[PDB]
Write a protein that binds this ligand. Structure first.
Ligand code: CO
Length: 257
């Protein structure tokens, strides 16, 4: 299958997923000297008070913290978006070294990791229908740098041992995703894609300007996860990021001067 390894990584994905070479692929480099302030944008509305997390799953590529998306419980609105987008899951991308791991870059800077909070547009009824639409998803992306610990990430770090290998899951109720956000909601936005196969061009990206800090210990525990299943040779789950793709005929807009 596709992955991040030596012979199935991002540079191969186009063979099975030709849209990998499409017009609106993600991630991209965010050039802060060409992104333009857009006064038509509004503030983001992140409404996560009623979020219902359910489960955490190692899917062999990353791990997903999954939410109940059968009601408007944890929603994203505003910003560049029209309508209401429901949180379905979050996951991360991270490196083997603190100098790489993010998917988006900022003036070519790579962060240690990147958090993706994935939301789907309720007008399309379910996730699977939403990914078939150009405005089906909204992904809130948040950079991680290594520095101080992020207290609100620790409950995630402490369950990772229970989902070491591909296909393992664990109960993960009562997790508050608000504890993963930086102070500021200033953002960049542009139209793009999922960053894993099937690479569908269905995403309004909203990338926060302010990174969150995590500790070296927290990142190290991410790097103990495994791509492989139980009883297979160990392959550490690191460097599960796609590199920046060509911007093509797109503009990145900023919510801030
Ligand atoms: Co992602």
């Amino acid at each position: 299958h596709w992955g991040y390894g030596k012979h199935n990584g991002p540079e191969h994905w186009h063979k099975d997923f030709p849209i990998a070479k499409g017009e609106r692929q993600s991630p991209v480099d965010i050039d802060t000297h060409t992104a333009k302030y857009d006064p038509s944008l509004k503030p983001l509305s992140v409404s996560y008070d009623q979020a219902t997390s359910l489960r955490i799953l190692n899917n062999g590529h990353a791990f997903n913290v999954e939410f109940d998306d059968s009601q408007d419980k944890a929603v994203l609105k505003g910003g560049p978006l029209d309508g209401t987008y429901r949180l379905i899951q979050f996951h991360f991308h991270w490196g083997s070294l603190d100098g790489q791991g993010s998917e988006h870059t900022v003036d070519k800077k790579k962060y240690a990791a990147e958090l993706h909070l994935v939301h789907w547009n309720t007008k399309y009824g379910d996730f699977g229908k939403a990914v078939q639409q150009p405005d089906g998803l909204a992904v809130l992306g948040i950079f991680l740098k290594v520095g101080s610990a992020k207290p609100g990430l620790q409950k995630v770090v402490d369950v990772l041992d229970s989902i070491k290998t591909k296909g393992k899951s664990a109960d993960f109720t009562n997790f508050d995703p608000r504890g993963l956000l930086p102070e500021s909601l200033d953002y960049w936005t542009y139209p793009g894609s999922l960053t894993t196969p099937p690479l569908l061009e269905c995403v309004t990206w909203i990338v926060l300007k302010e990174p969150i800090s995590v500790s070296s210990e927290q990142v190290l525990k991410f790097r103990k996860l495994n791509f492989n299943g139980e009883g297979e040779p160990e392959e550490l789950m690191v460097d599960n990021w796609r590199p920046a793709q060509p911007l093509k005929n797109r503009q990145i807009k900023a919510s801030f001067k």
